[PDB]
Amino acid sequence: DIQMTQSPSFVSASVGDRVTITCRASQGISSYLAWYQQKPGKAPKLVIYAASTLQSGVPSRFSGSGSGTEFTLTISSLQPEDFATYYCQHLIGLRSFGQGTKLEIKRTVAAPSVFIFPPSDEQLKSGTASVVCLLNNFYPREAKVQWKVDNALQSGNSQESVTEQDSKDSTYSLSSTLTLSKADYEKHKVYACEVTHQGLSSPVTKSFNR
Amino acid sequence: QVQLQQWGAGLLKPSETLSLTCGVYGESLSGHYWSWVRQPPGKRLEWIGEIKHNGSPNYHPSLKSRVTISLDMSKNQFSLNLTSVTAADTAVYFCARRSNWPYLPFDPWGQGTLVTVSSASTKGPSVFPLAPSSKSTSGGTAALGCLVKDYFPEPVTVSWNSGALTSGVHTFPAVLQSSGLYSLSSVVTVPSSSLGTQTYICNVNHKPSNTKVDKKVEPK
Numbered sequence: 365d366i367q368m369t370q371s372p373s374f375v376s377a378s379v380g381d382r383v384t385i386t387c388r389a390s391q392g393i394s395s396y397l398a399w400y401q402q403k404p405g406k407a408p409k410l411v412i413y414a415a416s417t418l419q420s421g422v423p424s425r426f427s428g429s430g431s432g433t434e435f436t437l438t439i440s441s442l443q444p445e446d447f448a449t450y451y452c453q454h455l456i457g458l459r460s461f462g463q464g465t466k467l468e469i470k471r472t473v474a475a476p477s478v479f480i481f482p483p484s485d486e487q488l489k490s491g492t493a494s495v496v497c498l499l500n501n502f503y504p505r506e507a508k509v510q511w512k513v514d515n516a517l518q519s520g521n522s523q524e525s526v527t528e529q530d531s532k533d534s535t536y537s538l539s540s541t542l543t544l545s546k547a548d549y550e551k552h553k554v555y556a557c558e559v560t561h562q563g564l565s566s567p568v569t570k571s572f573n574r
Numbered sequence: 575q576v577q578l579q580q581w582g583a584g585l586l587k588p589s590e591t592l593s594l595t596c597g598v599y600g601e602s603l604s605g606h607y608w609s610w611v612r613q614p615p616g617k618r619l620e621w622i623g624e625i626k627h628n629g630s631p632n633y634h635p636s637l638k639s640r641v642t643i644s645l646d647m648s649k650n651q652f653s654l655n656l657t658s659v660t661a662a663d664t665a666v667y668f669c670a671r672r673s674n675w676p677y678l679p680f681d682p683w684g685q686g687t688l689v690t691v692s693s694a695s696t697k698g699p700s701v702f703p704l705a706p707s708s709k710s711t712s713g714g715t716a717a718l719g720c721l722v723k724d725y726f727p728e729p730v731t732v733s734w735n736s737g738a739l740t741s742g743v744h745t746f747p748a749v750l751q752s753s754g755l756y757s758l759s760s761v762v763t764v765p766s767s768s769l770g771t772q773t774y775i776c777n778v779n780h781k782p783s784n785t786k787v788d789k790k791v792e793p794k
């Protein structure tokens with residue numbers, strides 16, 4: 365089976381910047397390759413086919429080249445609408461796609477504002493306690509969130525959710541939710557979330573006492 | 575210009591049959607291949623198969639025994655059938671046109687159908703307040719929100735003060751909990767000074783269970 369591998373997995377670039385993303389096939393496929401653009405919640409759009417040929421209507425700042433095993437998609441100067449996930453595709457055989465390259469907007473490092481929320485009394489009636497830690501408006505996307513209950517590091521009882529880049533300021537927000545049973549929540553006192561991020565001089569901890 | 579429109583049931587239980595249909599408007603089925611492509615949550619596009627003449631389908635080998643693709647030529651429509659679905663068949667399913675060599679890419683595309691396979695029963699969300707507090711006043715800015723928990727299936731909509739409050743609002747993507755139910759939070763950052771003089775209500779709607787919740791969020 366022929367495999368398509370795209371690099372990098374993730375590109376951060378400024379508006380106006382040039383970007384080149386690559387697609388490598390595990391065996392030669394001559395020029396049987398296409399590139400698609402896909403935005404969240406939407407269908408892919410055809411950009412380039414036969415490795416280097418632009419689909420009609422596609423702007424000239426897009427170009428592609430390559431044949432055999434190494435292929436290139438290039439945008440000579442990015443505009444805001446160009447930020448998206450790009451897929452390459454083998455046009456015959458198993459018609460396999462690459463794993464995709466997400467192109468995100470670069471901007472200055474911005475530290476998160478961190479907030480912690482104890483569970484409501486209403487939720488405690490039901491038998492479950494959710495503790496929520498919010499990281500608001502930060503860049504870059506990477507952040508480490510650790511939960512501590514009575515100073516013990518928690519593992520396997522939290523889930524994170526991250527927003528797409530804000531269309532104006534290009535920042536991220538992140539929620540981490542710690543889920544405990546009512547009995548478990550009520551046998552401990554100190555609840556803390558500790559946030560590590562490139563924008564902070566040192567890890568920030570927000571906490572409360574039950 | 576040409577539009578591909580899709581319809582068909584997207585909420586399925588294990589072992590049932592996925593049955594989707596793609597309508598083509600602005601063009602005939604003639605002289606072209608018509609294809610289905612799917613995309614699991616957070617994963618890459620996967621070709622399922624395509625057909626030009628009834629009786630000559632071409633399928634992705636790992637799906638051949640479960641997949642039927644067929645043309646309804648009198649209506650210029652084509653359909654996808656996928657039997658004995660499991661949770662692993664959960665994905666957005668796209669239909670697309672594929673033209674004759676040497677012009678082989680997929681174009682145009684349907685808008686996609688979200689398909690969820692689960693044994694989970696339909697359930698309305700519980701809405702809990704994320705109350706603002708003085709140990710959440712980040713330099714004159716407070717944060718507050720609503721926790722929208724244990725619902726199925728997607729989606730829920732969330733607004734604040736009936737759509738009047740829009741600035742500083744972040745409604746996170748739903749996450750699938752280990753219970754098989756979705757959960758979500760919506761938050762907003764407001765001036766602290768406004769906490770004692772301004773009302774904040776999150777409006778939550780879950781149509782699959784006809785659930786409408788207004789929950790006022792007060793400080794503590």
Ligand SMILES: *[C@@H]1O[C@H](CO)[C@@H](O)[C@H](O)[C@H]1NC(C)=O
Nearest residue numbers: 591592593644653654655657
């Ligand atoms: C698809 O499968 C369903 C159920 O298995 C069946 O009733 C139907 O005839 C098949 N074909 C179409 C076009 O729906």
